[PDB]
Design a protein around this nucleic acid. Sequence first.
RNA 1: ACAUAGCGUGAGGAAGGCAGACCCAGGGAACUGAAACAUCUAAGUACCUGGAGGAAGAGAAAGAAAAAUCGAUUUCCUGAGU
RNA 2: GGAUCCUGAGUACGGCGGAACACGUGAAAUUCCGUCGGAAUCCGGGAGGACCAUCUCCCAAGGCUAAAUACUCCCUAGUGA
RNA 3: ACAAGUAGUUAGAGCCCGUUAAUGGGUGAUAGCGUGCCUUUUGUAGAAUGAACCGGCGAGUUACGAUUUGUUGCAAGGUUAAGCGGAAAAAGCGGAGCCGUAGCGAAAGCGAGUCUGAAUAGGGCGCAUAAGUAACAGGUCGUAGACCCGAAACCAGGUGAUC
RNA 4: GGGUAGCGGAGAAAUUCCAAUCGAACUUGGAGAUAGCUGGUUCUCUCCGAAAUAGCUUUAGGGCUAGCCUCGAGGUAAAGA
RNA 5: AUACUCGGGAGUCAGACUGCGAGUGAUAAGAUCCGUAGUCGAAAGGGAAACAGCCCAGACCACCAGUUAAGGUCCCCAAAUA
RNA 6: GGUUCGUGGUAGGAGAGCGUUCUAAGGGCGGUGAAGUCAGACCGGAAGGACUGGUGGAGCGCUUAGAAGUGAGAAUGCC
RNA 7: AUAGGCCCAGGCGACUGUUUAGCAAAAACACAGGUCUCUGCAAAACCGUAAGGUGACGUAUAGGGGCUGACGCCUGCCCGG
RNA 8: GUCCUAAGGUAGCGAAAUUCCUUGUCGGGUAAGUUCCGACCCGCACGAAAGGCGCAACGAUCUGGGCACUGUCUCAACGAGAGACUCGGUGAAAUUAUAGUACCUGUGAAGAUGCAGGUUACCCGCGACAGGACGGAAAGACCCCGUGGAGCUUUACUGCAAC
RNA 9: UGGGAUACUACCCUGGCUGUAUGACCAUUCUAACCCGCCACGCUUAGCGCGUGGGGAGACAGUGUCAGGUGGGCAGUUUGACUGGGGCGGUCGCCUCCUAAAGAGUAACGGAGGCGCCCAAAGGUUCCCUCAGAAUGGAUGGAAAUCAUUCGCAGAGUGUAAAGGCACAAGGGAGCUUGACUGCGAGACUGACAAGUCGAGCAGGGACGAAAGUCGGGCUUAGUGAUCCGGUGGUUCCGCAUGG
Lengths: 63, 97, 73
Amino acid sequence: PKMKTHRGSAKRFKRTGSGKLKRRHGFTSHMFANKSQKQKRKLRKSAMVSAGDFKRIRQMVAK
Amino acid sequence: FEGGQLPLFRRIPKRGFTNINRKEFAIVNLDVLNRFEDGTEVTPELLVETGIIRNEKSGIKILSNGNIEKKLTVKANKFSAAAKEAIEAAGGKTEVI
Amino acid sequence: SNGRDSESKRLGAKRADGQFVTGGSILYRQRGTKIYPGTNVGRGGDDTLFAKTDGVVRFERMGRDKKKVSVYP
RNA sequence: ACAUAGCGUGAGGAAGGCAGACCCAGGGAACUGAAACAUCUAAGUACCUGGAGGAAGAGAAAGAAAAAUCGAUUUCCUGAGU
RNA sequence: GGAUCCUGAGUACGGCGGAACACGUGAAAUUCCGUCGGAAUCCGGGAGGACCAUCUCCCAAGGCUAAAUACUCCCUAGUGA
RNA sequence: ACAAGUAGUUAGAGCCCGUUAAUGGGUGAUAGCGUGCCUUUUGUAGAAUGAACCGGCGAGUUACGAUUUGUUGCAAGGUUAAGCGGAAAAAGCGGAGCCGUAGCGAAAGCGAGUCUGAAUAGGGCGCAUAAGUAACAGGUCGUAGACCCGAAACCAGGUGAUC
RNA sequence: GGGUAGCGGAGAAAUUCCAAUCGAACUUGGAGAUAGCUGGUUCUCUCCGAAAUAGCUUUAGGGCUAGCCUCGAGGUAAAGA
RNA sequence: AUACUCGGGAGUCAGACUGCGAGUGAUAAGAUCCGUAGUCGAAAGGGAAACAGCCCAGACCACCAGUUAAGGUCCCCAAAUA
RNA sequence: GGUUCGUGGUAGGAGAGCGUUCUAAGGGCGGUGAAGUCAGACCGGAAGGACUGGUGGAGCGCUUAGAAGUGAGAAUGCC
RNA sequence: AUAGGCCCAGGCGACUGUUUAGCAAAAACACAGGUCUCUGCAAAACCGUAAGGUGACGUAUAGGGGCUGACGCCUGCCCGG
RNA sequence: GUCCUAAGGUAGCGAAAUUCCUUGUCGGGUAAGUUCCGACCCGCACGAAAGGCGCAACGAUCUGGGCACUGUCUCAACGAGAGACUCGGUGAAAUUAUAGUACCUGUGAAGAUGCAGGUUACCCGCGACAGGACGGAAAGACCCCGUGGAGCUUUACUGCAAC
RNA sequence: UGGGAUACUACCCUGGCUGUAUGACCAUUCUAACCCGCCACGCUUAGCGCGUGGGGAGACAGUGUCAGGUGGGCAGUUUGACUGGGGCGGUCGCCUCCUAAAGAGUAACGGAGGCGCCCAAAGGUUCCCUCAGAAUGGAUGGAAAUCAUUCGCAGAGUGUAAAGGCACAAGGGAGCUUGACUGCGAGACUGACAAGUCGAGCAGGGACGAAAGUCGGGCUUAGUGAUCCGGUGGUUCCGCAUGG
Ligand SMILES: [Mg+2]
Ligand SMILES: [Mg+2]
Ligand SMILES: [Mg+2]
Ligand SMILES: [Mg+2]
Ligand SMILES: [Mg+2]
Ligand SMILES: [Mg+2]
Ligand SMILES: [Mg+2]
Ligand SMILES: [Mg+2]
Ligand SMILES: [Mg+2]
Ligand SMILES: [Mg+2]
Ligand SMILES: [Mg+2]
Ligand SMILES: [Mg+2]
Ligand SMILES: [Mg+2]
Ligand SMILES: [Mg+2]
Ligand SMILES: [Mg+2]
Ligand SMILES: [Mg+2]
Ligand SMILES: [Mg+2]
Ligand SMILES: [Mg+2]
Ligand SMILES: [Mg+2]
Ligand SMILES: [Mg+2]
Ligand SMILES: [Mg+2]
Ligand SMILES: [Mg+2]
Ligand SMILES: [Mg+2]
Ligand SMILES: [Mg+2]
Ligand SMILES: [Mg+2]
Ligand SMILES: [Mg+2]
Ligand SMILES: [Mg+2]
Ligand SMILES: [Mg+2]
Ligand SMILES: [Mg+2]
Ligand SMILES: [Mg+2]
Ligand SMILES: [Mg+2]
Ligand SMILES: [Mg+2]
Ligand SMILES: [Mg+2]
Ligand SMILES: [Mg+2]
Ligand SMILES: [Mg+2]
Ligand SMILES: [Mg+2]
Ligand SMILES: [Mg+2]
Ligand SMILES: [Mg+2]
Ligand SMILES: [Mg+2]
Ligand SMILES: [Mg+2]
Ligand SMILES: [Mg+2]
Ligand SMILES: [Mg+2]
Ligand SMILES: [Mg+2]
Ligand SMILES: [Mg+2]
Ligand SMILES: [Mg+2]
Ligand SMILES: [Mg+2]
Ligand SMILES: [Mg+2]
Ligand SMILES: [Mg+2]
Ligand SMILES: [Mg+2]
Ligand SMILES: [Mg+2]
Ligand SMILES: [Mg+2]
Ligand SMILES: [Mg+2]
Ligand SMILES: [Mg+2]
Ligand SMILES: [Mg+2]
Ligand SMILES: [Mg+2]
Ligand SMILES: [Mg+2]
Ligand SMILES: [Mg+2]
Ligand SMILES: [Mg+2]
Ligand SMILES: [Mg+2]
Ligand SMILES: [Mg+2]
Ligand SMILES: [Mg+2]
Ligand SMILES: [Mg+2]
Ligand SMILES: [Mg+2]
Ligand SMILES: [Mg+2]
Ligand SMILES: [Mg+2]
Ligand SMILES: [Mg+2]
Ligand SMILES: [Mg+2]
Ligand SMILES: [Mg+2]
Ligand SMILES: [Mg+2]
């Protein structure tokens, strides 16, 4: 049978042109009194999946 | 699985939604229009016969990428601002079917 | 009743005297001014010394008791 | 009391079996997976019961759509691991 | 032709409780079961994923229907890197 | 038949043979050296495990997906699926579909750019630095019992009070 | 000669007995249950050749990423020693 | 004479002793826990009687050749009764 | 074809091979004795391969390719 | 040949009985007796989805349940939980 | 006096099937008594139907003392039968890596038939004995571990019957 | 007489309470559903059942659906790890120091302490300043309060542990303020990842300052917790035929 996509991941990662995965940052709901405005500006941007993580998860989101 | 450390996908938030009405256009860069003979009327039907676009998803959009030499009459569902200018700059007319 | 300690904070020199650095390079991590911001060097909010311009790092005596780090293009 | 029940006679019919398969229905687990586990999974599976038929079920739109149209159902490929 | 008449009622649907729908009650359309309530009926009714309006497509609550599909206790003739 | 032996090995007389004819075969006084095999372990001759012996049988497979390398065909293209046809053929037909040829954005959208932003700024991802696709083969992964053997248990339908 | 049957019987009560089985009989099936555990895994030579660590972990004799091995390919103020 | 980058494939996450530097302990342990180097692990050979972890030293194969290392040279036992 | 530096090794990575059953094509052997089996002092770097003779009494190699129920000494393995 | 050894004193259990088939026979269980409590009869209690049953072809001097355990002398205080 | 409580243990009994200290102390019994009997009460931690304290009869019950009696013993002797042993017949089993299978001191995974250095020792059996082969038997029941079971409990969580 | 007036008055209104539209709500009675483990008769040689007639009961009971409560009677499960064996005890995240062997890092159920905040100024800026203690003299006034002089590198202070800093102060006054800004960010540190840290400079628009300039909280380093799910505000996004 066909491999199944990991749906949790398909709702969180996006594949870039070069074939990398782009993601959002964690600490970005609530508890915003506890984070600095600089932290907030940084956490608001997207990020790439690290090489180590990518090795672990790439089959989960092929397709 | 990470042996019980919370996996990466659960450390990070879900984002966005999918549009039920998402339109995706078949893209035609100018370069491939040079294929055609000068003073020719390029339609979608002519763009699928020749074999330049097989499936015309939501329509045919012309994009600038490359440079056009011939003086054509191109009809497509959409044009990039640059594409329109370039088709005209050569000495052609764009129509939006 | 003991058994506690904080994470080590990796303080100290991050670039060598005579090494070429790019603007923004952290030169020294420190609590307070063990070393002072010299020429073309800034002191960050946590006392981190960073190069303000590209150039070569030079650790220098200020006068008798104190020490500064400068970046010369 | 009329009569009904009941009782008798005569016709028809049923009963049981199974191909340890396939089909439709009633009833319906747990181990297991979730690195525990309760929602969830296993699975409407195994199993039991009934009904069958050579197949069953479905089926001639109070349907699919919205390229402007298609024209009962079923099965395969695809859509799509969307 | 359209004076009149007919076109499936405890039905459709709704509340409550479940189930089936890929869809775990969810914003939950669609389909079924129990229970209670309960229409319209051609100037009518249903659907288009809550719902209303418009438009479009349909006419439920009756029934039948071959073939393309599944399987092999069997029979005949054959086959097998 | 004065010897202390993981049983051989190296040196080696003596005796007995005579070959796929080789700086050969059998035996072995005596001398040196020498704690089986496997598993599991920091470490086993192990006083840890397993095997009486011999024989047979006895453990990474296949299907469908993913990915990567190799090969071949074609190449900005590549390829057909079910099916028809047929010999459980080979072609031919079948372009529906799939991947690639454009990306960026949650999305509307815009497009060699796009998103963010008041910005003609900076920055992210892209382009400028085109090769893919079909098939087969190797490696690895996923779903399947998924390298083999092994529980105690759990559930379902039956069978038992001749003890 | 009979009755009570396993989500059950029976017990002057011991967890006692229900066919040499009982803190829940036997048998067949689900079923090749599951086993981060133990054992086992079969021909040869050539080249290279570790680790027994960090971090996180209902984690500690398991796992994951990193470190250390290997094979292939790339690229140059050669960056290594 | 390697580094680095990108891909394919791993195994490992029980370590041991010795020397040196520390803690814990009693300035005990073949103890325990770090740091640092080595050997073992995965290393046969020589020495230390025997003796993974010490001293010397790395086995591609053959030779009834030679020179050395630690350690030795009266006999067991090769070499000085130097 | 030389030169230089190499060639201890567990887990493990990489490579080249041996042998087994079956298929195809080619080419062979075999009642003047096939396979199997027994023996031997032969050959190859290994897995392995021949030759000769006994037994045996009818099938079997080789070459190139292909496919696998493809190799056992350990499982308190099963018979 | 076959046929009680006896006595003194203490603990526990009144007694005859019963029990861990196959390591325990006892001081354990039971027991007559005590007490509490439920039950007005389609009784309560119990088995069963139900029907149907047991209770009982009984009827509070009866029936079910808990505790105590012959007999003798007795059985105190606390109703806040 | 005083604090607290719902209330603070009455009768009886008490070093006990209950007493840690403990062989408590005293008495008795004995030449000598951690047991036993009688007292005492500082009851670690008795106590009135999970009954208190007595109690004739009863017991393959437990405990202490005495008489009878004796191979229980001082301390062993002799005799009988069965087996053992020899011969004739028949003929298993557990176990088993191969074995030409000494001792001492050492060494070593820290307890050696098998390693070192010594010391002993002709070859093959039969009757006997069990010190060793960490002998055989049984994948330790103790102990720990496993995100293993199972039975049991409850004011653990979530449920379900029943009412 | 009082801030409120008395009567007429009309919107009303408060305590008592009658007619009239409802309504359930009790409470009793009734009989015809339903029930009878009552009697008589029949089916019928029947202690079942059904029927017929009496009696009893009765809108209850029983039964269906829905709801709350009780609920180890029964069920499925959970009930952590580290640990000089396990249990008991202690511990679990973060900050500072020693261990730590003069970079960084570095273990132990090793040695010591802190944190889970606070501050509208204890933030920003401009200007001005200097502390502890002692000696001597002096009303209440004491060893020690507030004056004065002298000496005083810091023996003080720095919201709060400790370490590193700080007297051009980072310590102490005062004036004006809200940069405790919005968009960002070359480049670096740290790092398995998730995260964490620093940052010149650019743009917008400001505060203070004559200007130079400084300012994206606080001398620095603790004061925190992911995802999923919910709530609230905004929104040139989507809106399942179309408008919503
Ligand atoms: Mg939010
Ligand atoms: Mg530390
Ligand atoms: Mg700050
Ligand atoms: Mg699991
Ligand atoms: Mg419903
Ligand atoms: Mg569903
Ligand atoms: Mg609707
Ligand atoms: Mg309904
Ligand atoms: Mg509807
Ligand atoms: Mg709609
Ligand atoms: Mg929908
Ligand atoms: Mg109609
Ligand atoms: Mg001799
Ligand atoms: Mg002699
Ligand atoms: Mg054995
Ligand atoms: Mg592949
Ligand atoms: Mg169960
Ligand atoms: Mg039976
Ligand atoms: Mg009987
Ligand atoms: Mg039995
Ligand atoms: Mg199963
Ligand atoms: Mg099995
Ligand atoms: Mg090597
Ligand atoms: Mg956790
Ligand atoms: Mg291991
Ligand atoms: Mg060391
Ligand atoms: Mg040690
Ligand atoms: Mg090892
Ligand atoms: Mg060695
Ligand atoms: Mg030696
Ligand atoms: Mg070894
Ligand atoms: Mg030599
Ligand atoms: Mg020499
Ligand atoms: Mg000599
Ligand atoms: Mg070598
Ligand atoms: Mg090698
Ligand atoms: Mg390999
Ligand atoms: Mg053959
Ligand atoms: Mg043979
Ligand atoms: Mg095989
Ligand atoms: Mg064998
Ligand atoms: Mg008795
Ligand atoms: Mg008796
Ligand atoms: Mg017994
Ligand atoms: Mg007995
Ligand atoms: Mg009854
Ligand atoms: Mg009792
Ligand atoms: Mg009684
Ligand atoms: Mg006495
Ligand atoms: Mg009482
Ligand atoms: Mg009592
Ligand atoms: Mg009693
Ligand atoms: Mg005595
Ligand atoms: Mg005999
Ligand atoms: Mg020793
Ligand atoms: Mg010894
Ligand atoms: Mg010896
Ligand atoms: Mg031995
Ligand atoms: Mg033994
Ligand atoms: Mg065991
Ligand atoms: Mg066991
Ligand atoms: Mg339970
Ligand atoms: Mg379960
Ligand atoms: Mg533990
Ligand atoms: Mg210990
Ligand atoms: Mg301990
Ligand atoms: Mg340091
Ligand atoms: Mg929401
Ligand atoms: Mg709409």
